[PDB]
């Protein structure tokens, strides 16, 4: 199927508590493979991604050097952002960025990403065209002007179409036995009375990978979007994910409700009912 | 593989 590589970067100022902490976490799909942290001298490889162990000292020296450079740039960006927003030196602020690429089954670029946020709000993002920017406010229009003057979009595009796609193809080949494996959900339906005239039906999906899944309840073949309580997909801690969807139904009507489960690990969607 | 951020905000 399709695959993605993403880095999630966070720089947080902590006045009176040293220089801003900077963290960069890399993912292939829903598998974290590396973590860089300014609080640490060396990167940390994830044990659930042993395929990254394959990389030599040239890879690590170059990535460590890039991370140190990025740490310097983001620390300087936080200082400049305080100024752009007329903020005092007293408060803690956060700068985040996410970037990476999506590739099709052929390994070709489907799309690139490069977005930034300041204090949890969109700041500036590279558009899908990989040439123009979306600036959220007047401060980000200042950055957009500096970046258009320095032709930054050309440099980010070069990374996204080049390095990003090439390295993702390499990680996928090295970790093919795991990264290309979808684990289907293990499913079951539970039933608990709420009152003498209503009961909750809960449809469970456990042990699946990747995280993308669709759980829907239907009543007489109609989606119950508004009446379904859907928890956020959660990590089990062993590479897999879990999710549930519940619906409150009139007692005696349980057989009119069917849970529909869609996941990459399944050849065709599952239809489940409560089995008393 | 990391991307180098040459220009700041």
């Amino acid at each position: 199927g399709s695959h993605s590589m993403r880095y999630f970067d966070t720089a947080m100022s902590r006045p009176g508590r040293g220089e801003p902490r900077f963290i960069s976490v890399g993912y292939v799909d829903d598998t974290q493979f590396v973590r860089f942290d300014s609080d640490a001298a060396s990167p940390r490889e994830e044990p659930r991604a042993p395929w990254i162990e394959q990389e030599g000292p040239e890879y690590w020296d170059r990535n460590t050097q890039i991370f140190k450079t990025n740490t310097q740039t983001d620390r300087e960006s936080l200082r400049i952002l305080r100024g752009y927003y007329n903020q005092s030196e007293a408060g803690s602020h956060t700068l985040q960025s996410m970037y990476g690429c999506d590739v099709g089954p052929d390994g070709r670029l489907l799309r690139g990403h490069n977005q930034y946020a300041y204090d949890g709000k969109d700041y500036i993002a590279l558009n899908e065209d990989l040439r123009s920017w979306t600036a959220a406010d007047t401060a980000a229009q200042i950055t957009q002007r500096k970046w258009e003057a320095a032709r930054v979009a050309e440099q980010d595009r070069a990374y996204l179409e080049g390095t990003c796609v090439e390295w993702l193809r390499r990680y996928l080949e090295n970790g093919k036995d795991t990264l290309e494996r979808a684990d289907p959900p293990k499913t079951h339906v539970t039933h608990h009375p709420i009152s003498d005239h209503e009961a909750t039906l809960r449809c469970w999906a456990l042990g699946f990978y990747p995280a993308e899944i669709t759980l829907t309840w239907q009543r007489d073949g109609e989606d119950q979007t508004q009446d379904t309580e859907l928890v956020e997909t959660r990590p089990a801690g062993d590479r897999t994910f879990q999710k549930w969807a519940a619906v409150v139904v009139p007692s005696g009507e349980e057989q009119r409700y069917t849970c529909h489960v869609q996941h990459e690990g399944l050849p065709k969607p599952l239809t489940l009912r409560w089995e008393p | 593989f990391l991307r180098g951020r040459a220009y700041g905000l």
């Binding site: 999630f8 947080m12 976490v25 456990l206 990590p235 | -």
Partner: protein, 99 residues
């Protein structure tokens, strides 16, 4: 400006009394990133608990998984206690086998 955490408490595998498992507390949808998370056994803080590396979703909100190896029993009650800037007092979510 600030987002309060969502909290789920659950086990890695379906719980079985006497069988070794992992107790999880997933905190997500919060901003800013500083958060205090404790896993509790019968109201008491479990001293050594591991956690995932700070990351975030497409909407920029942070998430973390706190976990510890455990063996569920009939009498033992587990919970997660979370504190964040958005919360006036710590929020306690109990582990319910069917949640």
């Amino acid at each position: 400006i600030q987002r309060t955490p969502k909290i789920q408490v659950y086990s890695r595998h379906p719980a079985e009394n006497g069988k070794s498992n992992f107790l999880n507390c997933y905190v997500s949808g919060f901003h800013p990133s500083d958060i205090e998370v404790d896993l509790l056994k019968n109201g008491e803080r479990i001293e050594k608990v591991e956690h995932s590396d700070l990351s975030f979703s497409k909407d920029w909100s942070f998430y973390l998984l706190y976990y510890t190896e455990f063996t569920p029993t009939e009498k033992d009650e587990y919970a997660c206690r979370v504190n964040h800037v958005t919360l006036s007092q710590p929020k306690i979510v109990k582990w319910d086998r069917d949640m």
